[PDB]
């Protein structure tokens, strides 16, 4: 995933956080990718599409 965070430092703060797609597919922030800054790896309960948008709910 991209555009959620600006740098890998921010991702580490949210590692393990709960996320979902518009379709309702639930996932998790697994690890921050070294290159480029802000990109990160996530695992979802089912395969997602490129058109989907992932959301992290926070308060």
């Amino acid at each position: 995933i991209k555009d959620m965070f600006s740098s890998a430092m921010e991702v580490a703060r949210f590692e393990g956080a709960q996320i979902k797609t518009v379709s309702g597919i639930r996932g998790e922030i697994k690890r921050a990718l070294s290159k480029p800054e802000g990109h990160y790896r996530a695992a979802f309960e089912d395969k997602i599409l490129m058109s989907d948008i992932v959301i992290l709910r926070s308060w």
Binding site: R26, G27, E28, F44, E45
Partner: protein
């Protein structure tokens, strides 16, 4: 062999499906037995079932370890092969040796270009009981899968906080007696299932004064595995870590060998269900 193994699985699978159907019948016989002993009236369904009452005369004279392990439990000592993933790192080779020393009847085998169907077929020919395959990430063990032959189950674990004995200086050599086993805090049926799988990797009938103990301690589905050597003192017991340390968390359990990806799953870890955090299955 191949024809014999195939039929034996079909008969085993057929026997299970009948047993699930027979479970209601078994309970009905229990009600009849209780009523005869206590004298209470039978329920209406049992009262009008003439066939069951006639059958009860023959079935009156009717009376544990899992079905796969029941045949050889406590009779034949296990035969275990410990292998790794293709092109293993040096650390994984060392760790595979440590796991080999952990189990008294384990043999380490090099997996260079061995194919998974070939590996299981080769082990089944030689009478091997279990197969252990280890994975790693940059020289850090990550997973451990145990496949019980000839027909499963296959239990896969993920290893965390691994501390190998090669990291210890002047550690010395291990003792290779048949060790005592400790299974702490396994309550649920799945916990009993895991205990049965892990228990049978060891030889039966350790000596009472055996000086080596292996403990599998369940703490929130993370089974801590430790190996200790103890000396009975005059006012208690003193133990010492021999290693390795690691915590293993079950995440899959299939009714078949590790080769068969189509084997029916006995249990899997659901991580994305909303109530995942709340309950501990083991």
């Amino acid at each position: 062999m191949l024809r014999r193994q195939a039929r034996e699985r079909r008969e085993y699978l057929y026997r299970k499906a009948q047993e699930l159907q027979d479970s209601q019948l078994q309970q009905k016989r229990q009600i009849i037995k209780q009523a005869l002993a206590q004298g209470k009236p039978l329920p209406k369904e049992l009262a009008e079932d003439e066939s069951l009452q006639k059958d009860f005369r023959y079935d009156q004279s009717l009376k544990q370890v899992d079905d796969e392990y029941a045949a050889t439990s406590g009779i034949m000592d296990p035969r275990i092969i410990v292998t790794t993933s293709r092109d293993p790192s040096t650390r994984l080779s060392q760790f595979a040796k440590e796991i080999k020393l952990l189990f008294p009847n384990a043999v380490r085998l090099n997996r260079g270009n061995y194919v998974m169907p070939n590996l299981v077929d080769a082990c089944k020919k030689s009478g091997t009981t279990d197969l252990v395959v280890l994975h790693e990430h940059r020289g850090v063990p990550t997973s451990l899968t145990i496949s019980h032959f000839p027909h499963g189950p296959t239990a896969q674990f993920s290893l965390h906080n691994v501390v190998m004995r090669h990291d210890i200086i002047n550690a010395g050599n291990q003792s290779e007696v048949n060790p005592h086993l400790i299974f702490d805090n396994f309550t649920t049926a799945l916990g009993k299932r895991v205990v049965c799988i892990l228990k049978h990797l060891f030889n039966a009938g350790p000596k009472k004064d055996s000086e080596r103990v292996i403990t599998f301690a369940n703490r929130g589905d993370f089974i801590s595995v430790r190996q200790h050597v103890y000396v009975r003192t005059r006012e208690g017991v003193e133990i010492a870590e021999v290693g390795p340390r690691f915590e293993m968390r079950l995440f899959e359990l299939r009714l078949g060998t590790l080769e068969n990806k189509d084997a029916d799953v006995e249990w899997q870890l659901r991580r994305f269900i909303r109530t995942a955090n709340k309950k501990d299955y083991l």
